[PDB]
Amino acid sequence: QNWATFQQKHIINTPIINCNTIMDNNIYIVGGQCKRVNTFIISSATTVKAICTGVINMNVLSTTRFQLNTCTRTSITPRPCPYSSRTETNYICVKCENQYPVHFAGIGRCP
C-alpha cells in the first residue's frame, strides 16, 4: 500500500529462508487467512525503488532481472500455514504510485 510496507513485505538480504517461519507474520494474514503467495526480492531497496522513477500511477515491468525467492502456500490450514520455496532470477512487475513501488504485481511480466 506504501513504500515502507512494500519494503517490509518484499525486500530481504539473503536468499536462504524458511518460508514456513518468515510467512508466520500478521502482515501476511489477509482477511484473516494466510496469504497464498509472497515473492521476496533479494536486492538493495534503492534498485527496486528505481523501477518507478517518474511513474505516477501504473504497473511497470522492470528492465533488469532480480534475485527472487517466492513462498507459495501448499495448503489452506490454520495459522501457521505451510509454504514451499522457489528461487529464480527474473524481471518483476510492480504497481507504481507517485514514483513508489506499493504492490508486487507479478514475476516475468505484468498482469
Curated annotation (Swiss-Prot):
<keyword id="KW-0964">Secreted</keyword>
<feature type="disulfide bond">
    <location>
        <begin position="19"/>
        <end position="71"/>
    </location>
</feature>
<dbReference type="GO" id="GO:0004540">
    <property type="term" value="F:RNA nuclease activity"/>
</dbReference>
<keyword id="KW-0430">Lectin</keyword>
<feature type="disulfide bond">
    <location>
        <begin position="34"/>
        <end position="81"/>
    </location>
</feature>
<keyword id="KW-1015">Disulfide bond</keyword>
<dbReference type="GO" id="GO:0030246">
    <property type="term" value="F:carbohydrate binding"/>
</dbReference>
<dbReference type="GO" id="GO:0003676">
    <property type="term" value="F:nucleic acid binding"/>
</dbReference>
<keyword id="KW-0540">Nuclease</keyword>
<feature type="disulfide bond">
    <location>
        <begin position="93"/>
        <end position="110"/>
    </location>
</feature>
<feature type="active site" description="Proton acceptor">
    <location>
        <position position="10"/>
    </location>
</feature>
<keyword id="KW-0732">Signal</keyword>
<comment type="similarity">
    <text>Belongs to the pancreatic ribonuclease family.</text>
</comment>
<feature type="active site" description="Proton donor">
    <location>
        <position position="103"/>
    </location>
</feature>
<comment type="subunit">
    <text>Monomer.</text>
</comment>
<feature type="modified residue" description="Pyrrolidone carboxylic acid">
    <location>
        <position position="1"/>
    </location>
</feature>
<comment type="function">
    <text>Preferentially cleaves single-stranded RNA at pyrimidine residues with a 3'flanking guanine. Hydrolyzes poly(U) and poly(C) as substrates, and prefers the former. The S-lectins in frog eggs may be involved in the fertilization and development of the frog embryo. This lectin agglutinates various animal cells, including normal lymphocytes, erythrocytes, and fibroblasts of animal and human origin. It is cytotoxic against several tumor cells.</text>
</comment>
<keyword id="KW-0378">Hydrolase</keyword>
<dbReference type="GO" id="GO:0050830">
    <property type="term" value="P:defense response to Gram-positive bacterium"/>
</dbReference>
<dbReference type="GO" id="GO:0004519">
    <property type="term" value="F:endonuclease activity"/>
</dbReference>
<feature type="binding site">
    <location>
        <begin position="35"/>
        <end position="39"/>
    </location>
    <ligand>
        <name>substrate</name>
    </ligand>
</feature>
<dbReference type="GO" id="GO:0005576">
    <property type="term" value="C:extracellular region"/>
</dbReference>
<protein>
    <recommendedName>
        <fullName>Oocytes ribonuclease</fullName>
        <ecNumber>3.1.27.-</ecNumber>
    </recommendedName>
</protein>
<keyword id="KW-0873">Pyrrolidone carboxylic acid</keyword>
<keyword id="KW-0255">Endonuclease</keyword>
<feature type="disulfide bond">
    <location>
        <begin position="52"/>
        <end position="96"/>
    </location>
</feature>
